[PDB]
Design goal:
This is part of a larger assembly, with 1 copy of chain A, 1 copy of chain B and 4 copies of chain C.
Chain A lengths: L1 H7 L3 H9 L12 E3 L2 H5 L8 H6 L8 E3 L8 H5 L18
Parallel strand pairs in A: 1-2
Chain B lengths: L1 H5 L3 H8 L3 H10 L2 H13 L3
Chain C lengths: L1 H16 L10 H14 L3 E4 L8 E4 L14 H26 L13 H6 L14 H10 L6 E4 L4 E11 L8 E9 L1 E8 L10 E22 L9 E4 L6 E4 L1 E3 L3 E9 L2 E7 L3 E18 L6 H6 L9 E15 L10 H11 L14 H6 L3 H20 L2
Parallel strand pairs in C: 10-14
Antiparallel strand pairs in C: 1-2, 3-14, 4-5, 5-6, 6-14, 7-13, 7-14, 8-9, 11-12, 11-13
The chains are: A mainly alpha, B mainly alpha, C alpha+beta.
The complex binds zinc ion (2 copies).
The site of one zinc ion has 2 residues of chain F, from loops.
Organism (chain B): Rotavirus A
Protein name (chain B): Outer capsid protein VP5*
Subcellular location (chain B): Virion
Chain lengths: 98, 48, 397, 397, 397, 397
């Protein structure tokens, strides 16, 4: 729970997990960066946003990356013209509109 | 023995010390093993 | 109960840790616990006793906190601490005795003394400390309805019973077959005797059985099983079953063959040992079944043929025995055993203060009667009083 | 092993210290140790069981750290901690059982379960805590190759053995000289008998000797020596050595003469007690030698003289016995005493889960066979299983 | 003594808690205590030994403090600590042996060795720590002149006595009435025998009594009382009182009737049990008086009647027995018992180093003599040596 | 179990309270509870069945909340609620059946079905609502470790027995004395008969006893005691004890003399009634002892006298009986009574789905066997299944 982590101020557990690459789900109302870039997806740019937590002992600057790859993406030819399965380590916990 | 294992009342102890038949028979009927054993000892010692 | 244990534990840790010259870093946490105990107990009045010859005593707490500005304890610090600890220990002793001398058919585990009822309030939960001892640990476990376990050395699980059962007899008691046994504490000695030495028995083998049901389920018990009952191997004169007359027993011991010891739980054979002696293990059982046979020796030297005739006059009576001792065991309920003094302490307090016989326990805390009728109410009351006795023993030497 | 003991110790401390109302200063260190354990264990997967009927279980550790409270921890804190404590206790239980049910002929000291092998890795060494238990202490000492010590009450050091030796004998078994003994658990009971009552022996003295060797040296042992053997003091019908026939033994007990008890170590006489009975001390020994005599009484009253005639017919057989009981001892190896539950626990786990017989221990953990052939590999395995059993008993009743 | 115990306790805690990989928060206070011990002992020189073969040894302390900056102990820290701990443990062991091998007729409670005399100085008080052990706790209570208490399993309280008394006797030893008894360790086996089976005794009853005093007052004792004496239920040939001749004893066992057991303190009856067997409790006593009667059966089957004629030629001799065993007890004085090994340790040290027989204890620390003449000076010296032996056993296995 | 009860209670309350036209103020709290239940159950997956013929079912919860803004509910609201209520009721029904059909020899009190194991989790604790039914409140009290009590009208506490005991008997069965009895459900009918009408008995009185022990202690019991055993007052042809032959019983009923009924707890008389018939109260007992005498009429009119001659030919046999009915009682353990349908529900479910016989209960849930061998595991499983049966019956009818 990001709220409890921030309130308690002890980042030992999250720091250990982020250092040792242990799967975890950070729960809390977060703002995300919408990225429609297939090359940004390939660059694994969504996994480079958590180090600031360890560096600063704060979680109010955490801003996950939500990939949005469509036909109106400027790089969708990479998805269309090659035999690969787009993949990202991170996922954003969000609900589709009603 | 009776006081240790049964904690008799003050009145009962008074009557037993005075050798009151009422308290003696009350204990006998109540089936106190200690009193019954003492009385049986007396009856058996009444050999002849 | 937990608060009483915590008081006792704090006082014991104070009497042992707070010693002149010791670093304050060795006793900082203990002194914090002690100060919180004093703060919580201050301004409360308690009354103990009033039952039997136990005197009515009143307790008032207005104490100052132990200091915390010293890097090492000196004589004065220990002196003041001891002055406070003596009064607290006296209060704990009287609370424990007042609780031990009381019973209740309903809610046996609930506090019975006024002092313990008052301590059960929520303001006193602030002083709880650590519940490390075996009895308080099991108290908390049974309070949460977990699996408790007490480890006993020679558990006192069998009520005293010395008796005999005859399967063949006559008015003259000159040709008898049957069994004799003593069950006592943790030891069963059983001897089957046959006067005819199975001369007319089918296959010259006489079967004997002995069933000892335990009042509680023992677990992981180490048991010593030896092939002879030394208690029934000498001449005896024994009252007849009705008591009218007496009969003569003149044993001569043979080895028991086809020894089968079966430990059963709810009628299901959990462990079974055949012709096995020494240390055996019974993991979980509530009944013991000993089967053993007297077999007439197929070949006899003259001195044995003289012993065992085929005519009626049977001067020497064949006997085969077994001894079975429970060296150690584990029980979910509480029992008196050879290594613990809890039953002795409870009985001593009751006898010393002439506590009137109550509605739950038998007179004088007679263990034979307790175990013979170990009802759930008796178990609850006994566990409460044993826990209080252990708490008291923490402090009173 | 040390990691497993540390997990058990920290869980026991958490159960016995994290209780509603206690100060946070009382459990600061414990909570730090607990959170270190959680951090180290998190993300690791373990598998336990798979031998006999022990189920295969998979363990995953995904827990949050224990929190803090300003002054006194409350019910919510206790419940939240209890969930994690229960899961960890279950895990440690299963690891200990999977270790107990396994053995290895070579490298018996080494961990045998995959769980314990994983825990032996370097990453978990941060979970060590304090190794205070007696068995973990001796485990560490044995690992360092230092002298160890286990204190046993009635150590079960003698393999069960009831036998007799006949130094003089005839087919009719009417004039026998010899000695019958029972060595069981912690007791020796030896009776030397002569049917002629040393009528035709030099100085009218018949010598008897009984030499009992012990598999493992014992140090600083308290022993009780008494001048009679109650087990061999009543009439018996005993099978012959060949088993062909049976002979009759009708003893009359005389006092043993010139009783000398020697405790030897490596063939050197360490302790010697001459006609002394009661409590003696044997500081170091691996053999016991009991030498006693039957001295024909020089002057016998008429009733006595009737018993011992010059000529052959001997109806009463002179018997002189000794009893010896090791009440307490210290051994560098591991034994099954009469007060501990480790042997019972190991045997109970094996029997409950129907573990097949392995290559090290005898079937059913038979203590007679185990101590009769207490090989060094067997001792390694037994120490390992007993250490893990004690670790498990820390947490399980 | 408190300083010596503190040294042993801090070294034991260093052995257990200072282990590779543990959090420094688990050893911070222990390391501060260890550094305080090092500081206090630095610059000091002690000498031990010089009595018997106990070699003379000299100790000088110049040790550096242990580091306090690690987050988790590593191998180097443990090795460095172990280097100091080895020397300290050797010094403590030698001091304890030197103390255990010395006596004093007057002021035997005080330290006897030069090393412990030096440790008794105030400058060493800073090494105090916590006196949590049972024996050191009783030592502190003794010093503070409070009430002490030791709990013993099977206390060795009865001075060894195997004997008989003949109330009715003749030179022929054919019509004897009297008692035989063995008081040993914690068991009293007493039989009363009548050769005439009370044929002429008034009321056809023969009364027997047996008084066993104790050299110390036992408290809250659990006792087992069984209605037969196995040790005195088989044929015997006993030397006469003068030793001139031997007399024959061929017993037949009858039940003891009107069995009374009294526990008295300072000659005053404290507890009395009439015709009650099994587990009993004696809260506070110093003397045991057992009383029991042989009642000639009024009715007898032919086999029983053949045994007890009206005339002199008595072949079978009626006897009635009792067995009283002290399972557990509490005493204010130190005693040898079945569970503890302090007597064994002291005796072993004295035997190993060939200490000349002193002016206080009997040769070889003979417990029979010690407890037959348990004088107050012997009690003081014995408590001193027992406390030192426990302190030593904390460290040396 | 608490969560399951809360689910069933919420669904029953929704069925009862959510009706057309009702003020929303009448069901505001209920709808808050219903929405909380829906939220907690959403997104979770459950499986039920798989044992016997009970189908394997999968349950998923993706329901929408209920409106909270109307003033009076309308038909639309009722239908919208009912659609969800049907699914939840079906889920509760199947979970309850799955729990009923199962049993465990170890920890029978804990949940056995995987659905109930999942509901045991902490996440579902938000569904608790109310615990006001008898069985759920007794469950909670037992877990809290307080006194419980179930009130029964005609409790089936007596295992079905119908048998006789013959104290005087011959092969011809012409002259018999003894008793006959039927102990069934909540009634005891006993009849002592004597064929000679105590012609030769001492004082012409024949004593009869009948002891009925119970498997559980009953408290505050109302009982009807009447002076005739109507079941044993007509001619009968019974079969011999070993079944060899048949004997005749032609009773003539006399008044029972000296009627004593004793209600005993732990072998001590708690209640006792002498010559008193009608309604009586037994406050706390576990054994019923009935004593009654056949007293030969001292004065007889000729018609009476002709019945009872002094010679063997006896055509009329004097019989005296008692009938005892337990109308109401309170017991700590669950039983089967005449008013509740829990035993019927459990047995019906097991029979309908053809559950294979398990390791705990007897075949067919035979109440006679169950109450004959009412063991701890059986009691735990029986209480669990009865609580689940009550929870299910809240919804299914
Ligand atoms: Zn013992
Ligand atoms: Zn009705």
């Amino acid at each position: 729970n990001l709220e409890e982590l921030m309130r308690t101020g002890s980042y030992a557990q999250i720091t250990n997990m982020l250092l040792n690459n242990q799967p975890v789900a950070l729960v809390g109302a977060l703002p995300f960066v919408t990225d429609s870039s297939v090359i940004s997806l390939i660059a694994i740019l969504d996994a480079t946003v958590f180090a600031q937590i360890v560096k600063l002992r704060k979680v109010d600057t955490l801003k996950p990356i939500l990939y949005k790859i469509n036909s109106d993406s400027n790089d969708f030819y990479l998805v269309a013209n090659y035999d690969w399965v787009p993949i990202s380590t991170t996922k954003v916990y969000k609900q589709v509109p009603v | 023995n009776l006081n240790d294992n049964y904690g008799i009342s003050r009145q009962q102890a008074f009557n037993l010390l005075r050798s009151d038949p009422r308290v003696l028979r009350e204990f006998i009927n109540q089936d106190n093993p200690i009193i019954r054993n003492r009385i049986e000892q007396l009856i058996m010692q009444c050999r002849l | 109960m937990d608060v009483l244990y915590s008081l006792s534990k704090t006082l014991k840790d104070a009497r042992d840790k707070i010693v002149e010259g010791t670093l304050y870093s060795n006793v900082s946490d203990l002194i914090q616990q002690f100060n919180q105990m004093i703060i919580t107990m201050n301004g409360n009045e308690f009354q103990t006793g009033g039952i039997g010859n136990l005197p009515i005593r009143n307790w008032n707490f207005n104490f100052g906190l132990l200091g915390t500005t010293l890097l090492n304890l000196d004589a004065n610090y220990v002196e003041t601490a001891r002055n406070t600890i003596d009064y607290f220990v006296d209060f704990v002793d009287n609370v424990c005795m007042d609780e031990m001398v009381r019973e209740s058919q309903r809610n046996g585990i609930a506090p019975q003394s006024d002092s313990l009822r008052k301590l059960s309030a929520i303001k006193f939960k602030r002083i709880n400390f650590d519940n490390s001892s075996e009895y308080i640990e099991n108290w908390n476990l049974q309070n949460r309805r977990q699996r408790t376990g007490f480890t006993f050395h020679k558990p006192n699980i069998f009520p005293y019973s010395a008796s005999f059962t005859l399967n063949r007899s006559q008015p003259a008691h000159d040709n008898l077959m049957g069994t004799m046994w003593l069950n006592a504490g943790s030891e069963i000695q059983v001897a089957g005797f046959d006067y005819s030495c199975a001369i007319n028995a089918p296959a010259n083998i006489q079967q004997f059985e002995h069933i000892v049901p335990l009042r509680r389920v023992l677990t992981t018990a180490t048991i010593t099983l030896l092939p002879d009952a030394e208690r029934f191997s000498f001449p005896r004169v024994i009252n007849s079953a009705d008591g009218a007359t007496t009969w003569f027993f003149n044993p001569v011991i043979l080895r028991p063959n086809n020894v089968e010891v079966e430990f059963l739980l709810n009628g299901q054979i959990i462990n079974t040992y055949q012709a096995r002696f020494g240390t055996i293990v019974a993991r979980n059982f509530d009944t013991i079944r000993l089967s053993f046979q007297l077999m007439r020796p197929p070949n006899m030297t003259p001195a044995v043929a003289v012993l065992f005739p085929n005519a009626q006059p049977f001067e020497h009576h064949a006997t085969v025995g077994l001894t079975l001792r429970i060296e150690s065991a584990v029980c979910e309920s509480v029992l008196a055993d050879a290594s613990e003094t809890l039953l002795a302490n409870v009985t001593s307090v009751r006898q010393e203060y002439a506590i009137p016989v109550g509605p739950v326990f038998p007179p004088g805390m007679n263990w034979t009667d307790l175990i013979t009728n170990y009802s759930p109410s008796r178990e609850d009351n006994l566990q409460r009083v044993f826990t209080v006795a252990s708490i008291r023993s923490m402090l009173i030497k």
